[PDB]
Coordinates of C-alpha atoms in Angstrom, one line a residue:
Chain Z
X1 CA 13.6 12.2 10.6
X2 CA 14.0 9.2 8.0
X3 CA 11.1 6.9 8.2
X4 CA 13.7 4.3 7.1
X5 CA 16.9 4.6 7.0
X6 CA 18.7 5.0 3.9
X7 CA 21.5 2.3 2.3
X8 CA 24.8 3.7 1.9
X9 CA 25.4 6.0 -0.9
X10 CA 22.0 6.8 -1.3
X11 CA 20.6 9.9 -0.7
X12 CA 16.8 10.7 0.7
X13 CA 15.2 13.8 -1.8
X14 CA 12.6 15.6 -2.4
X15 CA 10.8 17.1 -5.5
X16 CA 7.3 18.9 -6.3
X17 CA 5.3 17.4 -9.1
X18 CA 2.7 19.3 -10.2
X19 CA 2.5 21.1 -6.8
X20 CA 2.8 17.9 -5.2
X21 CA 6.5 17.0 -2.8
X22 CA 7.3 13.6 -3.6
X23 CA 9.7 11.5 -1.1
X24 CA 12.4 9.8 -2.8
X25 CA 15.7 7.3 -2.6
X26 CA 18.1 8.0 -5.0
X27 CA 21.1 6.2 -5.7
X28 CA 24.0 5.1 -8.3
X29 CA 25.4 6.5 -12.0
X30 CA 24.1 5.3 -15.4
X31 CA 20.8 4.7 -17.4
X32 CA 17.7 5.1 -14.9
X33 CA 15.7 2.7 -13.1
X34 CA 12.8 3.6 -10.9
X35 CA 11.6 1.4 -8.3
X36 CA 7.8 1.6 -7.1
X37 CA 6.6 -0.1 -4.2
X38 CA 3.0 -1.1 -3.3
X39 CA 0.5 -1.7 -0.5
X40 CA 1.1 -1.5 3.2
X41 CA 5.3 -0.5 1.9
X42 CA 7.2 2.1 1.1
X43 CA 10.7 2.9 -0.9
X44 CA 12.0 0.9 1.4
X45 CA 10.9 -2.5 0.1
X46 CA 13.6 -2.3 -2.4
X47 CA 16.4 -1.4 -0.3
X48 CA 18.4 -4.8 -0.5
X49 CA 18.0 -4.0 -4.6
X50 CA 19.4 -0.8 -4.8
X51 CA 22.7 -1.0 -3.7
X52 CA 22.9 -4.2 -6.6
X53 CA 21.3 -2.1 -9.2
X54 CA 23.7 0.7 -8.3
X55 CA 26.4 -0.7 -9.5
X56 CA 25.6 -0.2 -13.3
X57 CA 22.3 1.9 -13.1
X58 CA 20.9 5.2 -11.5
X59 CA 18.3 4.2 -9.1
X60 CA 15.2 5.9 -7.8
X61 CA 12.5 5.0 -5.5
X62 CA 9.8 7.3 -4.7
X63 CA 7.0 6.7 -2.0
X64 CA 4.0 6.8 -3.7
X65 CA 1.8 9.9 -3.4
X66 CA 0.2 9.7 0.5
X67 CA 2.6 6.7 1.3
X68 CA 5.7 7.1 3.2
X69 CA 6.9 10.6 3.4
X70 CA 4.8 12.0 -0.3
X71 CA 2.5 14.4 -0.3
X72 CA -1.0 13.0 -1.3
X73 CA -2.1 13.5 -5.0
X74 CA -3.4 17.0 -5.3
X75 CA -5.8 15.3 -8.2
X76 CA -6.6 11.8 -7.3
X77 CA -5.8 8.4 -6.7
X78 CA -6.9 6.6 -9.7
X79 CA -4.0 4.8 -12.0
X80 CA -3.8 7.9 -14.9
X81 CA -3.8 10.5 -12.1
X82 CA -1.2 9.1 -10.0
X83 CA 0.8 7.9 -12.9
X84 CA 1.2 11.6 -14.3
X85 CA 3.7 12.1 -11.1
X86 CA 5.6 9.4 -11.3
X87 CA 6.1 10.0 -14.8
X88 CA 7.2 13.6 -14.6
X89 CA 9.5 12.6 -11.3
X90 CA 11.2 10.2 -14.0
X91 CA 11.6 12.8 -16.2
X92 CA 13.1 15.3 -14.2
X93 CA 15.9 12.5 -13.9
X94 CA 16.0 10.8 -17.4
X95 CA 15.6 13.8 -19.7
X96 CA 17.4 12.7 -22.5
X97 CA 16.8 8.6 -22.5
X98 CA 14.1 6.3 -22.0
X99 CA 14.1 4.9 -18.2
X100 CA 14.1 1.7 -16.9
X101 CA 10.4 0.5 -14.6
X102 CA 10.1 -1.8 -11.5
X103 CA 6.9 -2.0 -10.2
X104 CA 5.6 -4.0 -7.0
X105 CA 1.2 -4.7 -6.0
X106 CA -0.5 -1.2 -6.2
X107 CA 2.9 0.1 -8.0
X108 CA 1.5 -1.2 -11.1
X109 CA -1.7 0.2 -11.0
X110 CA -0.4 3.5 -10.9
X111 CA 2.5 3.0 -13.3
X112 CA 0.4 1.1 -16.3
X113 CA -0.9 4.1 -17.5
X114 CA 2.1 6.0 -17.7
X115 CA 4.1 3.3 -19.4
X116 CA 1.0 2.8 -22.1
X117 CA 1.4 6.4 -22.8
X118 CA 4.8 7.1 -23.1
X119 CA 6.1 4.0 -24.7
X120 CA 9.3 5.4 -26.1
X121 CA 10.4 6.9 -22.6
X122 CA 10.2 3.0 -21.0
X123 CA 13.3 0.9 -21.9
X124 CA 12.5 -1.8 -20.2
X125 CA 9.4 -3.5 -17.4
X126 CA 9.4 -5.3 -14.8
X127 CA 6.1 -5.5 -12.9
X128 CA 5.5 -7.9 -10.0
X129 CA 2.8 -9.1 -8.2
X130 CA -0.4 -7.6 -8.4
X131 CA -3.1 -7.5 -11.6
X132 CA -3.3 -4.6 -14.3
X133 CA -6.6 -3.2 -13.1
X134 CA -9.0 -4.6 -15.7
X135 CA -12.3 -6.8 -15.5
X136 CA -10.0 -9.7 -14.7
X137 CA -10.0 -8.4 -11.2
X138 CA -13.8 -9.6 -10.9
X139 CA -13.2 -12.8 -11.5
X140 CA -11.2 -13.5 -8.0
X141 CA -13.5 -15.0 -5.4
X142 CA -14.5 -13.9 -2.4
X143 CA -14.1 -16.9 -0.2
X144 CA -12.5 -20.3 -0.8
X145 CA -12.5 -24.0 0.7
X146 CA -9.6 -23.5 2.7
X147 CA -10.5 -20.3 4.5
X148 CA -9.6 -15.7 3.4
X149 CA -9.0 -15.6 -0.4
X150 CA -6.4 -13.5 -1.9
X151 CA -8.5 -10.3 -2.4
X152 CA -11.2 -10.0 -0.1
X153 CA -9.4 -6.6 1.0
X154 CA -10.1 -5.0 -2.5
X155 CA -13.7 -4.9 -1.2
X156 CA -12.7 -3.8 3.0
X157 CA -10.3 -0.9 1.2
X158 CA -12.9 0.5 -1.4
X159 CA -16.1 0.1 1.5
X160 CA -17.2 4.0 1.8
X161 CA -17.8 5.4 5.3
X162 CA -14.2 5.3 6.0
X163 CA -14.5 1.5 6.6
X164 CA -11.3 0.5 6.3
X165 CA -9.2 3.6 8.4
X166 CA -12.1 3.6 11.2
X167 CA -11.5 0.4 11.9
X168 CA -7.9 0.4 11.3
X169 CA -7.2 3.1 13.3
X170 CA -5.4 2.0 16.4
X171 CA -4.5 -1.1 15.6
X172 CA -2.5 -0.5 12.3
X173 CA 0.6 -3.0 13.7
X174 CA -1.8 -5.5 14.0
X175 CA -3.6 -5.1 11.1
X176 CA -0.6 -5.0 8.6
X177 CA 1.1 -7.7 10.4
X178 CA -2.0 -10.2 9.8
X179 CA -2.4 -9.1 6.0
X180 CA 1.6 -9.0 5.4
X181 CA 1.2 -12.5 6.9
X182 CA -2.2 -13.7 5.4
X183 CA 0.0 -13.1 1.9
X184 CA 3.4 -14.2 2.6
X185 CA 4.9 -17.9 2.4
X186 CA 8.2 -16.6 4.5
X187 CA 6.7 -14.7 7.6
X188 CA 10.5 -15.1 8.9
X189 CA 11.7 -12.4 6.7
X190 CA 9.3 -9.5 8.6
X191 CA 11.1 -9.1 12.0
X192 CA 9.1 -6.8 14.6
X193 CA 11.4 -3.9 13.8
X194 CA 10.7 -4.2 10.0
X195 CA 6.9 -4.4 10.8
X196 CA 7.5 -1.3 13.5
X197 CA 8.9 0.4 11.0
X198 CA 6.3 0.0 8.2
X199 CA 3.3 0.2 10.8
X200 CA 4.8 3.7 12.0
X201 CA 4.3 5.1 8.4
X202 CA 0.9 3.6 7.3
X203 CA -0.5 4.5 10.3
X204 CA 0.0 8.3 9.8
X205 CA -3.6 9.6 9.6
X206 CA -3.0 10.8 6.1
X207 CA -1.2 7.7 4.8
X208 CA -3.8 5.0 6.2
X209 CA -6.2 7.5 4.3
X210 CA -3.7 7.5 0.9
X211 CA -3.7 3.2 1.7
X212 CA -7.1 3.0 0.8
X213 CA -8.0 5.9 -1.8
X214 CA -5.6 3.8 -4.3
X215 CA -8.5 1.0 -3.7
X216 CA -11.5 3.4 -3.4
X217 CA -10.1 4.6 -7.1
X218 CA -9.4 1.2 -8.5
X219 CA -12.6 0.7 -10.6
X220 CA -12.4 4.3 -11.7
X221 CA -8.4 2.8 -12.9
X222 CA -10.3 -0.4 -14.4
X223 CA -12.5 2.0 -16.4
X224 CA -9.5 4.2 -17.6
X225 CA -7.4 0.8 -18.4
X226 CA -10.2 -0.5 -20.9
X227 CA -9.4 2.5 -23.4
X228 CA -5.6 2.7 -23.0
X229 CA -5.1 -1.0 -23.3
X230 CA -6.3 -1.1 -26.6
X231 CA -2.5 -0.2 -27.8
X232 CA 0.0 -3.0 -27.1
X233 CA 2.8 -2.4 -24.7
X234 CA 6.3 -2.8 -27.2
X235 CA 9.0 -2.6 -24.9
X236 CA 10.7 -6.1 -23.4
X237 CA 8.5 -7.2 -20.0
X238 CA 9.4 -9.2 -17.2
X239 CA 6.8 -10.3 -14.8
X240 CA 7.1 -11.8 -11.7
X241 CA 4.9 -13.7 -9.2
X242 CA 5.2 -15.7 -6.2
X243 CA 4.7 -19.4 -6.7
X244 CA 3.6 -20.0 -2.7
X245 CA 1.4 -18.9 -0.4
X246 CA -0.1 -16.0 -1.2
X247 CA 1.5 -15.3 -4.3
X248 CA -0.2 -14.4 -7.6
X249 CA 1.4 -17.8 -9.4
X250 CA 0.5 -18.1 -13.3
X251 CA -1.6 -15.0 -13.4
X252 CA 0.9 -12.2 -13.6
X253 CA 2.2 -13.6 -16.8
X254 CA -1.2 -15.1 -18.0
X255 CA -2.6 -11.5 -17.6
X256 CA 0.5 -9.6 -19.2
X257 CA 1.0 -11.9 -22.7
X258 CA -2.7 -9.8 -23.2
X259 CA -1.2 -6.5 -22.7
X260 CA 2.9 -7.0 -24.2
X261 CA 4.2 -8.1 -27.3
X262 CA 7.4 -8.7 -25.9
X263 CA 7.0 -10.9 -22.4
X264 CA 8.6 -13.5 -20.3
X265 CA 7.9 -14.7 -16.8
X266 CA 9.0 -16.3 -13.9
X267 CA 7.1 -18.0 -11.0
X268 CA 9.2 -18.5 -7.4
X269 CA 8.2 -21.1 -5.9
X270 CA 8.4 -21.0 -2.3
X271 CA 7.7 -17.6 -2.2
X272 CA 4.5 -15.3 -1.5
X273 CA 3.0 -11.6 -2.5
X274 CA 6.5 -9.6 -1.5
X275 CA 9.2 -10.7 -3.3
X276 CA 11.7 -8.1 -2.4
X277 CA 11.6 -9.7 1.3
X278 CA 10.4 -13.1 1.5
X279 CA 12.6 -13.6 -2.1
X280 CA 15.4 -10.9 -2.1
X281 CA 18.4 -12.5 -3.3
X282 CA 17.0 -14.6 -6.9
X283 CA 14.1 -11.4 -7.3
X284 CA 17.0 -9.2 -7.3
X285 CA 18.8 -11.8 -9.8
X286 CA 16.0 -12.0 -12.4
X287 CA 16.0 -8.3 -12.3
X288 CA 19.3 -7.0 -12.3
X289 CA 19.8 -9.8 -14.8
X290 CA 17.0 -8.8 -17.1
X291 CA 17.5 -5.2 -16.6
X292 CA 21.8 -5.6 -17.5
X293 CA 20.9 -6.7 -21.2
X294 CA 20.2 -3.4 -22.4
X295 CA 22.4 0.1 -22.0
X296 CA 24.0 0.2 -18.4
X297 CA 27.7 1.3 -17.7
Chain H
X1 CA -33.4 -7.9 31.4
X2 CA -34.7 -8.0 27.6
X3 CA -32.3 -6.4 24.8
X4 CA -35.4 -5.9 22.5
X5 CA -39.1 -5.3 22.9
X6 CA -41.7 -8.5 23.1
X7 CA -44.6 -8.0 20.8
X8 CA -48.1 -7.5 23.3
X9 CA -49.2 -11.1 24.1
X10 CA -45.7 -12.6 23.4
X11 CA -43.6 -14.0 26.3
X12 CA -39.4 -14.2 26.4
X13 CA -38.6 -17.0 28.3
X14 CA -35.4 -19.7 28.2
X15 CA -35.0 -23.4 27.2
X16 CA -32.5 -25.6 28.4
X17 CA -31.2 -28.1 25.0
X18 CA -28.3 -30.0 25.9
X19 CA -26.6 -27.9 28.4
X20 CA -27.4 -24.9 26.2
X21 CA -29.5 -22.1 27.1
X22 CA -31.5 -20.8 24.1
X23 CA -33.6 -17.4 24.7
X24 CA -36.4 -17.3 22.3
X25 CA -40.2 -15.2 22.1
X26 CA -42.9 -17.0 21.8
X27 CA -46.9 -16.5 21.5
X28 CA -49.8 -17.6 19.4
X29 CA -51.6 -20.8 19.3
X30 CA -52.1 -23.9 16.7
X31 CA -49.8 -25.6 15.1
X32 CA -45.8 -24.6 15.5
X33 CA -43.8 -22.3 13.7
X34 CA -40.2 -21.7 14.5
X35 CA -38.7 -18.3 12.9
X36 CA -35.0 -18.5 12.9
X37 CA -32.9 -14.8 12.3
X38 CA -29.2 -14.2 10.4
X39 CA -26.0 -12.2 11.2
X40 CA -26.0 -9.0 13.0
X41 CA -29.5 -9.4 14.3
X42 CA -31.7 -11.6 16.7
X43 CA -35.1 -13.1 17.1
X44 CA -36.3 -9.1 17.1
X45 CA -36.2 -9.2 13.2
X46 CA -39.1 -10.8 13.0
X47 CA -41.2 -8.9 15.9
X48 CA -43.3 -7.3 13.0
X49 CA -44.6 -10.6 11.2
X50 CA -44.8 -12.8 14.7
X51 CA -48.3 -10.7 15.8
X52 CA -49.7 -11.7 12.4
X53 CA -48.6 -15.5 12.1
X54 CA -49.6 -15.7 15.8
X55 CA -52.8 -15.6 15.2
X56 CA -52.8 -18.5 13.2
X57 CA -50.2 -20.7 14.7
X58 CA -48.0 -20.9 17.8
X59 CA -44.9 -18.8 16.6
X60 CA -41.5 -19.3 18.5
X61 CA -38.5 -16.9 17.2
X62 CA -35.0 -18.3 18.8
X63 CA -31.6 -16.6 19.8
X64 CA -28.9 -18.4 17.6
X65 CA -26.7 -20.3 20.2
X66 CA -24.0 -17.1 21.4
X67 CA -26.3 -14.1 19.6
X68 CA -29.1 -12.3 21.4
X69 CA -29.3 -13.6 24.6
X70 CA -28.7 -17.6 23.9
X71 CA -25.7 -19.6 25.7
X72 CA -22.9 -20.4 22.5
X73 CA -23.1 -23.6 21.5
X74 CA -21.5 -26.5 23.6
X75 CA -20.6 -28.8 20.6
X76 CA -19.7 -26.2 17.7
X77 CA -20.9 -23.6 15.0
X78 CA -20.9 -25.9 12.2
X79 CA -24.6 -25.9 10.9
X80 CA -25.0 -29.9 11.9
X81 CA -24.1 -28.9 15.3
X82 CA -26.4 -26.0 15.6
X83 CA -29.0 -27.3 14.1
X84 CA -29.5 -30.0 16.5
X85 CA -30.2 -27.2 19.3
X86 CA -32.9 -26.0 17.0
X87 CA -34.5 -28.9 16.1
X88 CA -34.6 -30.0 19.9
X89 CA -35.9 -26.5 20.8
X90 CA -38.9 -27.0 18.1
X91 CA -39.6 -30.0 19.1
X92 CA -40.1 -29.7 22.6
X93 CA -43.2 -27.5 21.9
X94 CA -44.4 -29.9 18.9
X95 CA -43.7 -33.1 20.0
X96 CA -46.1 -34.9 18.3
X97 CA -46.2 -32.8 15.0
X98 CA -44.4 -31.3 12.4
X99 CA -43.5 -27.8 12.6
X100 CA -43.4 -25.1 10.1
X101 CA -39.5 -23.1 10.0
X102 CA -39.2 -19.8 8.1
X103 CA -34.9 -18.6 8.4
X104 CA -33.0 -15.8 6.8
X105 CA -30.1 -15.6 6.4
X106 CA -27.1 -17.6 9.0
X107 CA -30.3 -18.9 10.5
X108 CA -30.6 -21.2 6.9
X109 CA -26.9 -22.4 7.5
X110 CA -28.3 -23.9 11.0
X111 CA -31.3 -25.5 10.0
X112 CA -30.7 -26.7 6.5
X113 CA -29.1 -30.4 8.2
X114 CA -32.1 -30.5 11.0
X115 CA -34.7 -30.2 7.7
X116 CA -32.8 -32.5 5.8
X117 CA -32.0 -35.5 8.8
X118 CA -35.7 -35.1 10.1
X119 CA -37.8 -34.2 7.0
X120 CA -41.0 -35.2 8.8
X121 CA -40.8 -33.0 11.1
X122 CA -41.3 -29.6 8.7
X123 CA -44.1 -29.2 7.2
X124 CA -43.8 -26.2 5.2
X125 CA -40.2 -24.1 4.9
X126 CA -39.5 -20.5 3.9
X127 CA -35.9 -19.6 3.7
X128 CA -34.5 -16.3 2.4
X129 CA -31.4 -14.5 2.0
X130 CA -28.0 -16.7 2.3
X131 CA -26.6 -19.4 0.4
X132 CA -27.2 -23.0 1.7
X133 CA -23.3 -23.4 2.4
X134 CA -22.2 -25.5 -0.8
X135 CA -19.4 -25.1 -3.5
X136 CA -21.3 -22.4 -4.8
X137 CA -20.5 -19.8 -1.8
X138 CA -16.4 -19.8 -3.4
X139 CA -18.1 -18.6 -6.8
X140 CA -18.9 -15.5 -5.3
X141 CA -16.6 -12.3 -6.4
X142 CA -14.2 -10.5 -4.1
X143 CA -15.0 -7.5 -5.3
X144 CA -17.3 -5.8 -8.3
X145 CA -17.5 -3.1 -10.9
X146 CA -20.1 -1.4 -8.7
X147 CA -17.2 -1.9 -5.6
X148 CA -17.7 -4.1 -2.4
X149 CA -19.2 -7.5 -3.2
X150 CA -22.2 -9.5 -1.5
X151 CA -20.0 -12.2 0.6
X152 CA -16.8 -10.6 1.0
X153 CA -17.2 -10.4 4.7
X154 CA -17.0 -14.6 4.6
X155 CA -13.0 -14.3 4.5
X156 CA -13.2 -11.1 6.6
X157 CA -15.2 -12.7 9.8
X158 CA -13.4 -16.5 9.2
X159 CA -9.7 -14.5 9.2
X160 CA -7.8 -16.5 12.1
X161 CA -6.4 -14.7 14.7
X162 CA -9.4 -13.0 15.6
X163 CA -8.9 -10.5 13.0
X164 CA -13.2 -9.6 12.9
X165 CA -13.6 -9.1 16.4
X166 CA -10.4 -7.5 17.1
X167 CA -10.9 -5.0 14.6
X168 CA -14.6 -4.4 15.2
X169 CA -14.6 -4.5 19.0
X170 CA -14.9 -0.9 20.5
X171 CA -16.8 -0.2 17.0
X172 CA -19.7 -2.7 16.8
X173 CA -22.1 -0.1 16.3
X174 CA -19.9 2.2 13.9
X175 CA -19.5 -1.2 12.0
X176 CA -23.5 -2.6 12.1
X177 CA -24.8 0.4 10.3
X178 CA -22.3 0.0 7.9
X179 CA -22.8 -3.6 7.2
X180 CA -26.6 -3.1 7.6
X181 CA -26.9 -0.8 5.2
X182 CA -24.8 -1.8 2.2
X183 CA -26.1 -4.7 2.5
X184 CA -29.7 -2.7 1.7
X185 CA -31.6 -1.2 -1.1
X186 CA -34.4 0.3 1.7
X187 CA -31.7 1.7 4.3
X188 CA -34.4 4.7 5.5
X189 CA -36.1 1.3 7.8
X190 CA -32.7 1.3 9.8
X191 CA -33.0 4.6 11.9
X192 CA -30.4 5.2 14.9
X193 CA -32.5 3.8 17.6
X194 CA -33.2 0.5 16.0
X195 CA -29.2 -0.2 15.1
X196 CA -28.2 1.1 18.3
X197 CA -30.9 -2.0 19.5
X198 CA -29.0 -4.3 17.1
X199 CA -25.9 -2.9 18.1
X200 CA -25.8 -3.4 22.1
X201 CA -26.9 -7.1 21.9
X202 CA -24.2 -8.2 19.2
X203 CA -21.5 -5.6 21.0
X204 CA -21.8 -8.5 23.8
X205 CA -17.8 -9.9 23.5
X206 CA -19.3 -13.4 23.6
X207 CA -21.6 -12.9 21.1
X208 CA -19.5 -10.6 18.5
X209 CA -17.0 -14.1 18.8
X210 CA -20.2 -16.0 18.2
X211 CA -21.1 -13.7 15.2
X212 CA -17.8 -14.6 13.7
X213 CA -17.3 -18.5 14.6
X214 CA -20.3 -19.3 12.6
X215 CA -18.3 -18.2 9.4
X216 CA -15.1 -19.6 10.4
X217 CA -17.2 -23.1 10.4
X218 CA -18.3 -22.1 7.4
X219 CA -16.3 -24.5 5.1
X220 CA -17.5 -27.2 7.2
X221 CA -20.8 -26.7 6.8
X222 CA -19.8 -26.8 3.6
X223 CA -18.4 -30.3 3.6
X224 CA -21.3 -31.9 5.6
X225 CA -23.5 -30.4 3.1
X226 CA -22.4 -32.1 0.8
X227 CA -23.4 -35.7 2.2
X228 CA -26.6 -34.3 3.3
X229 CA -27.8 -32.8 0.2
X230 CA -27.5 -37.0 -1.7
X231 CA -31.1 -36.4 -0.1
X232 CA -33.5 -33.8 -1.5
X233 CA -36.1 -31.9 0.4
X234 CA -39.3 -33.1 -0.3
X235 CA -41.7 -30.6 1.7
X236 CA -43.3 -27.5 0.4
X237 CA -40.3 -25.3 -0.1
X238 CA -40.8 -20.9 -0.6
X239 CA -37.5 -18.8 -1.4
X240 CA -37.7 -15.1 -0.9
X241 CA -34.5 -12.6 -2.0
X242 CA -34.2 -8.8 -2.7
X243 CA -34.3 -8.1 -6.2
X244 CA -32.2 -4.5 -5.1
X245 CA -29.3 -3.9 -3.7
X246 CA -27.5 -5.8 -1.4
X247 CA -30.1 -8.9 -2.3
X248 CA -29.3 -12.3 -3.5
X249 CA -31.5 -11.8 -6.5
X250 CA -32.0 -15.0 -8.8
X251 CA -29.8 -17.3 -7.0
X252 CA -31.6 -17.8 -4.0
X253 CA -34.3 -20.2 -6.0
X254 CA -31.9 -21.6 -8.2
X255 CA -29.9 -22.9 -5.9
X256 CA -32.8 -24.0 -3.9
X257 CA -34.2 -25.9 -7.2
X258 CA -31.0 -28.3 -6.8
X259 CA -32.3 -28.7 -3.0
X260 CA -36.1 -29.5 -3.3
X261 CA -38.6 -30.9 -5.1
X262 CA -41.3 -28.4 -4.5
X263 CA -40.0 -24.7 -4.4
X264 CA -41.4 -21.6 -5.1
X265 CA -39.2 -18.4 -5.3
X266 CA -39.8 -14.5 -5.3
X267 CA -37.5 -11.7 -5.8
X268 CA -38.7 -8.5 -4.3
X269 CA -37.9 -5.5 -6.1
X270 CA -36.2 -2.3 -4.2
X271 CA -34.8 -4.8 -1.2
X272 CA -31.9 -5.4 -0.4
X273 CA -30.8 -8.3 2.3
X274 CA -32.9 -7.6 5.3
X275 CA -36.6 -8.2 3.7
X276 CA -38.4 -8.5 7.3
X277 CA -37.4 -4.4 7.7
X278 CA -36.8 -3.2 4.0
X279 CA -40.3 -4.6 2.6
X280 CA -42.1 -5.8 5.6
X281 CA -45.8 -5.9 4.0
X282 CA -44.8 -8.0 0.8
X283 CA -42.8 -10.1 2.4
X284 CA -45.2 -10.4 5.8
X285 CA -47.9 -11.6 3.0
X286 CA -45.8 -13.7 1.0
X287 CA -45.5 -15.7 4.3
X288 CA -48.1 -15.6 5.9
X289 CA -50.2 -16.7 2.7
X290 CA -47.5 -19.5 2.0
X291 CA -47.6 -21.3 5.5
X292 CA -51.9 -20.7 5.7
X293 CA -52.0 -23.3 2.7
X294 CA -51.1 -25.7 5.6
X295 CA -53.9 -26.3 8.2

């Protein structure tokens, strides 16, 4: 029983990673691309991109270890643990040639470390919408003039004592709706079906866990970022951010010219933290776009 | 009905200050001193020093309008609004003096404009543990390399909505011990039965929605602040913060410095946030001594 339901063409998989069944969309003929969506999401965040990207790519979106319908990491949740997976599910697909990356929010966190590491397997990045755990994540404040800041949930997710799922638990609609809201610009674009939908998988006991390990791990990830960032990322970058309400505006591309060689960036105005919903149509542009000016058939 | 225990000698009673009405313990005699508590707690933090200051002066320990068992405020949670309860409360027993005010805490947020408008009126002040709500509260991180940060809970309890209470209703006592204690560097003080004391009173729906309307006025505190403080506090001035975990450390007294002429500050090692539990005999004598230089 799909948890979404799957664009034509596609096909919902599975595949065990080091002991651990990962949940996947899989689509289209050509070089790869894998997708990876974030926080409070699933595959399905980039189901209005696939279909476009299948037209000259092969395209994979996994759920994220714990999220969606993945098993949970059998090692952990910090970026070089989780990164190992989606690495060797990329793999298993692109043998032979380097693979295309997409990442969205926590995607990038537990993508980075992969990409750092393997350089010569990524052809080409795309990461939107969230920091590259490093001490840069300190810096974001706690409270501003105008009411919640942007982060104040990296502190409610980490909290021990089960903070965050205890008093989640039982009201994980209306939790997700307030947050998705609290960092959108176009609330329009998350009808109550499409928060249903997403609700109904968070809120599985194991993936509202999953949810908040990726935060409970992210100083852990910080720590493991401060020695792999010390080699240059080589491959061409994109970066993208939402210039609106809750979007991550200059940062994304601020933060990345300290970690690529090769980088450009785009702000949307008028847009917040999910692209792929409140932005689809020039998001999946700038992509497709960016991703067509290499090997695709 | 009382939700905690008077102190022998002590009497609860009620006050009616502009429509509102304001619990508070009082006992003692000489001259006034009003002890004013902070989030997630009542007058009963202070049940511990008010025998000892009692025997001195006349020591009166409020509900904050909507917490413990005072009315919410008519007018508003901004700090000028509550503040003028307070100041109205103290000065119905010290009509024709100055009074001392010792506040922790949210209880600093509603007295800092009743100090600053009637500065004859305090003789001696003692605040600990909160920022005076100025620019400085957005400097404050999200989130640390240790993991959850001092003030995060600001955007959490001001969330529109109703985010806090919906959230935390049902698991006010679930979510007091947790709050309670990371916010400490001494958590063995908070046993069971004294959070499940904390708990009950702040589990009232009126006063969890109370809790959290003090933050979401938060930012204008902020802004009348910042006419007020043109004026600096000229009174004998004493900061107190927890030098361990969960404290404000340094910053208490150096943001008080840009407040007032005549400050003192202490940071008391191995507390966190909630001094009058964690390290009740330093910071018992720290007050008592600092007051008893008044006659």
């Amino acid at each position: 029983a799909e948890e979404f339901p799957v664009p034509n063409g596609f096909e919902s998989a599975y595949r065990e990673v080091d002991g651990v069944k990962l949940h996947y969309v899989k689509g289209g003929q050509g070089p790869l691309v894998m997708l990876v969506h974030g926080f409070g999401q699933t595959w399905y965040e980039w189901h209005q991109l696939m279909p476009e990207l299948a037209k000259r790519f092969t395209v994979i979106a996994p759920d994220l270890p714990g999220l969606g319908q993945s098993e949970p990491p059998k090692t952990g949740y910090s970026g070089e643990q989780v990164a190992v997976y989606l690495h060797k599910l990329a793999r298993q697909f692109s043998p032979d040639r380097p693979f295309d990356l997409v990442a969205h929010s926590i995607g990038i966190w537990n993508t980075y470390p992969m990409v750092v590491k393997n350089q010569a397997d990524i052809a080409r990045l795309v990461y939107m919408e969230a920091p590259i755990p490093d001490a840069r994540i300190y810096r974001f404040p706690a409270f501003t003039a105008q009411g919640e800041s942007l982060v104040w949930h990296f502190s409610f997710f980490a909290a021990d004592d089960r903070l965050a799922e205890t008093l989640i638990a039982g009201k994980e609609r209306f939790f997700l709706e307030h947050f998705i809201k609290s960092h959108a610009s176009n609330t329009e674009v998350f009808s109550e079906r499409l928060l249903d939908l997403y609700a109904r998988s968070y809120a599985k006991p194991h993936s509202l866990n999953a949810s908040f390990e990726y935060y409970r791990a992210l100083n852990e990830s910080v720590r493991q970022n401060a020695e792999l960032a010390k080699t240059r990322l080589q491959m061409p970058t994109m970066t993208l951010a939402g210039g609106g309400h809750g979007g991550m505006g200059t940062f994304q591309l601020e933060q990345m010219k300290a970690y690529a060689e090769d980088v450009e960036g785009h702000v949307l105005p008028g847009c917040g933290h999910w692209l792929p919903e409140e932005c689809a149509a020039p998001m999946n542009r700038l992509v497709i776009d960016f991703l067509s000016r290499g090997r695709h058939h």
